[PDB]
Write a protein that binds this ligand. Structure first.
Ligand SMILES: [Mg+2]
Ligand SMILES: [Mg+2]
Ligand SMILES: [Mg+2]
Ligand SMILES: [Mg+2]
Ligand SMILES: [Mg+2]
Ligand SMILES: [Mg+2]
Ligand SMILES: [Mg+2]
Ligand SMILES: [Mg+2]
Ligand SMILES: [Mg+2]
Ligand SMILES: [Mg+2]
Ligand SMILES: [Mg+2]
Ligand SMILES: [Mg+2]
Ligand SMILES: [Mg+2]
Ligand SMILES: [Zn+2]
Lengths: 133, 50, 188
RNA sequence: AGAACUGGCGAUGCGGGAUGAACCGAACGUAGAGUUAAGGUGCCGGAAUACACGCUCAUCAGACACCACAAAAGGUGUUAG
RNA sequence: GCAGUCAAGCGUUCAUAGCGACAUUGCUUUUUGAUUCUUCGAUGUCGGCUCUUCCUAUCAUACCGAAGCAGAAUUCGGUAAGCGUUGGAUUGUUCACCCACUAAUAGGGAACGUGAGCUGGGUUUAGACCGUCGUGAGACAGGUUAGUUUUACCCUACUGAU
């Protein structure tokens, strides 16, 4: 349930990447298995960027969240990308938050900064985020 | 609007249908005008709305 | 079976003059003049008097003879077109969204616009052919009248208006909305 | 795949079937002239764009034995009965 | 494997919206057989990888017809091969089977395309082990492990260059 569109951002999280869990749902990391809205090309790995919704599995954390597939939203990206104002920027790590298909967050708090692109696209992430960029 | 509904019915509802190519045909037609089915004479009325 | 001779008769009123030469037909009447090119049928026109004209086919098959009666009908339609004219009436049919029809001018082309067809935001434009006049009848709700001397010009102009208002991706038996020809007659 | 009778190919060129061991015509010394076979005579291509009565219009017409394919079932297309 | 004809019946009523028994006519060479014409003074043999083009019996996209088509969703059919038809776990696999994304994850041909293009996991030399069989040497369209992949400077084709 994206609330608008998003200008293209450099992809840095292909399938198989592991990112930190930025919420308090009890999970510690997220293992990306798919990207929503990705295209098709032979041998090309689906990849995600800031603000994308992915399908992920929890590898470390509460056992009730393990061994299952759940949606997730990327909120920080270590790969540098260029904004339309001419600025190249990047974060120190890759992080995500567990969400349902409608975009509602499973947790209730977010630790660390959140990208501006993600906050605008997902209103629920913006509500639980403390500092944007 | 029975008068206006009847007027629109003769163009949209009162038709025949070819059983081989689904072509829309006049209600009094005996053969289909299409060459794909060989001008077959197997026709059925167009089904009415409920 | 190659009939030896097949004949048809064409009647002419008092005020109408007909000039035929090399299968070119011009009909002049009180309401104007019409011209038709018929150099694709191979018929022979002959004049009996000022009130009767005959057209015949010699040594013609079933298919060739069938076109002889068509020639008579086309010439007869021209004769009454310049004497009585043709008048086609259409009615607006809709369930919920009213249909707004108005005449507009675009670079001197005399178009006619249809607005709010099934709530569509798109504007539908239909050109108005030469010799065809469009009026909106009084004391009858949602009626448009097309008049002219040529029956083909009036009929095709009305047909274009009907096809421009066809429903897509819906059950046409339920969504009976559009503009349909309701009466065919003469101006007089 | 296996038999019967005959004619062939194999052992065989020549004219014809565009092309082909077996089909059609015809079997062979070296030449000239005449006439034909099977097959052909719009142009390629030698030879009537000959004559005569009909049939056929196909938005995948049809066009010659062996032979290089088409059926059941249908059409108020057209023709005759 | 794919497509027709006929219509007893199914479909609340109603043969033919969508289906359809008993019968019957075909098409295809992407299955497997039948045959043994070509090659045993040798046409490199499974699959994958890479890359081009072709077929339509059309999965998606464009425009339409039909419905037991109210809407939404779906189903049947037409013109259409222009344009696309994927990422992974197990298996040498073709095949198969799940996970997931997607407008969609359609089926096929090109010497069952493609080894002087690769790769060599499998099959199918010689080493070795096991089970059953054999007195034995040994056998097994049973399992298991280790096992050399050669040459283009010629002609043509193609790509560029005089
Ligand atoms: Mg011998
Ligand atoms: Mg031949
Ligand atoms: Mg000559
Ligand atoms: Mg033999
Ligand atoms: Mg070779
Ligand atoms: Mg060799
Ligand atoms: Mg091969
Ligand atoms: Mg090799
Ligand atoms: Mg090769
Ligand atoms: Mg080679
Ligand atoms: Mg090996
Ligand atoms: Mg060995
Ligand atoms: Mg080597
Ligand atoms: Zn039909």
């Amino acid at each position: 349930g994206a609330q608008g569109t998003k200008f293209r951002i450099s992809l840095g999280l292909p399938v198989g990447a592991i990112m930190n869990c930025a919420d308090n749902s009890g999970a510690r990391n997220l293992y990306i298995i798919a990207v929503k809205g990705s295209g098709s090309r032979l041998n090309r790995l689906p990849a995600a960027s800031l603000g994308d919704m992915v399908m992920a599995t929890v590898k470390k954390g509460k056992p009730e969240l393990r061994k299952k597939v759940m949606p997730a939203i990327v909120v920080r990206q270590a790969k540098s990308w260029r904004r339309r104002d001419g600025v190249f920027l990047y974060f120190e790590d890759n992080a995500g938050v567990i969400a349902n298909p409608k975009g509602e967050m499973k947790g209730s708090a977010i630790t660390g900064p959140v990208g501006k692109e993600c906050a605008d696209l997902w209103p629920r992430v913006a509500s639980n985020s403390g500092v944007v960029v | 609007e029975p008068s206006l509904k009847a007027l629109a019915s003769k163009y949209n509802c009162d038709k025949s249908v070819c059983r081989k190519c689904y072509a829309r045909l006049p209600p009094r037609a005996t053969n289909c005008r299409k060459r794909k089915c060989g001008h077959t004479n197997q026709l059925r009325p167009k089904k009415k709305l409920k | 079976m190659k009939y030896i001779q097949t004949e048809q008769q064409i009647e002419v009123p008092e005020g109408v003059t007909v000039s035929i030469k090399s299968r070119i037909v011009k009909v002049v009447g009180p309401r104007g003049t019409l011209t038709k090119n018929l150099k694709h049928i191979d018929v022979t026109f002959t004049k009996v008097n000022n009130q009767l004209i005959k057209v015949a086919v010699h040594n013609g098959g079933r298919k060739h003879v069938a076109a002889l009666r068509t020639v008579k009908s086309l010439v007869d339609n021209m004769i009454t077109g310049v004497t009585k004219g043709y008048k086609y009436k259409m009615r607006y049919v809709y369930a919920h969204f009213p249909i707004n029809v108005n005449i507009v001018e675009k670079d001197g082309a005399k178009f006619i616009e249809v607005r709010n067809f099934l709530g569509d935001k798109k504007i539908r434009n239909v050109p108005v052919r030469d010799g065809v006049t469009i009026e909106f009848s009084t004391n009858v709700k949602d009626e448009i009248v097309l008049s002219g001397n040529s029956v083909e010009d009036v009929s095709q102009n009305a047909a274009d208006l009907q096809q421009i208002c066809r429903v897509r991706n819906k059950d046409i038996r339920k969504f009976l909305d559009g503009i349909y020809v309701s009466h065919k007659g003469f101006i007089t």
